[PDB]
């Protein structure tokens, strides 16, 4: 998280930390329903050798864990619930080369206890428009290659899909309909390494509920000018998420 402020304890009860059994964090996630964690697809598989992606390239459920109700990055409190992993399902049309449909679902081995510090995030019932303020949270890298002690967050606007697809035209990197971009044109506030799968949420001012718009995916470095952080469009593959999870708002 580039140029962010520390989130207050209990304001992001849906964020999940995908970490090794060692404890070192490597990705983020979001609690959906009662036992599902949505995250980036590239978080749940190793680098391709046979450059094609196979099921054996995936990360074994007995090789990493998910922590809920977590506030610190390396410290612990009584709210942390360490949960194993049962199943991992990446998007069927996910492309590791173009990061297309960079989204996946993690079926928890043990369901967490829903309390004021652990509760799911809602699903988007419709598309999102330009200029919508969203909150992106994570424990990833900061400026000058640093890491925080608590959860970090930024509030950035959603960039127009046309201007973002044209923003990556110099780098010959396509931006598909399953990707959504955020961040200011001057740079600065952006996600970075370790924030993948992290939540990009906003508030339904009518229902008074926060819901997930996207998950951190990729981008050109972290916080560069004339560049926007790219996130997986949750509304695009919401039916695939609902078809696999079954949970609903």
């Amino acid at each position: 998280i580039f140029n962010g402020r520390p989130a207050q304890k209990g304001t992001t009860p849906w964020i999940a930390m995908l970490s090794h059994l060692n404890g070192q964090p490597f990705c983020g996630g979001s609690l959906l329903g009662s036992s599902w964690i949505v995250t980036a697809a590239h978080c749940l598989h190793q680098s391709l050798d046979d450059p094609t992606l196979r099921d054996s390239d995936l990360l074994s459920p007995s090789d990493f864990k998910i922590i809920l109700g977590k506030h610190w990055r390396l410290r612990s409190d009584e709210n942390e619930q360490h949960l194993g992993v049962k199943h991992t399902t990446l998007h069927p049309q996910y492309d590791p080369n173009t990061f297309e449909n960079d989204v996946a679902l993690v079926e928890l081995l043990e369901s967490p206890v829903l309390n004021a510090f652990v509760m799911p995030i809602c699903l988007p019932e419709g598309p999102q428009q330009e200029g919508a303020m969203v909150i992106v949270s994570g424990w990833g890298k900061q400026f000058l290659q640093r890491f925080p002690e608590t959860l970090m967050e930024i509030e950035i606007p959603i960039v127009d899909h046309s201007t973002c697809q044209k923003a990556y035209a110099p780098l010959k990197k396509k931006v598909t309909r399953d990707m959504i971009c955020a961040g200011e044109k001057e740079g600065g506030k952006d996600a970075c390494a370790g924030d993948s799968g992290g939540p990009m949420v906003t508030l339904n001012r009518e229902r008074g509920q926060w819901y997930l718009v996207g998950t951190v995916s990729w981008g050109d470095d972290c916080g560069k000018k004339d560049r926007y952080g790219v996130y997986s469009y949750i509304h695009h593959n919401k039916d695939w998420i609902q078809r696999v999870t079954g949970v609903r708002n």
């Binding site: 070192q24 980036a40 780098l171 390494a193 370790g194 993948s196 995916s217 981008g219 952080g229």
Partner: peptide
């Protein structure tokens, strides 16, 4: 460059 936002980042 264009890198994944994970740890480690899948840079390119």
């Amino acid at each position: 460059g264009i890198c994944s936002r994970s740890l480690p980042p899948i840079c390119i």
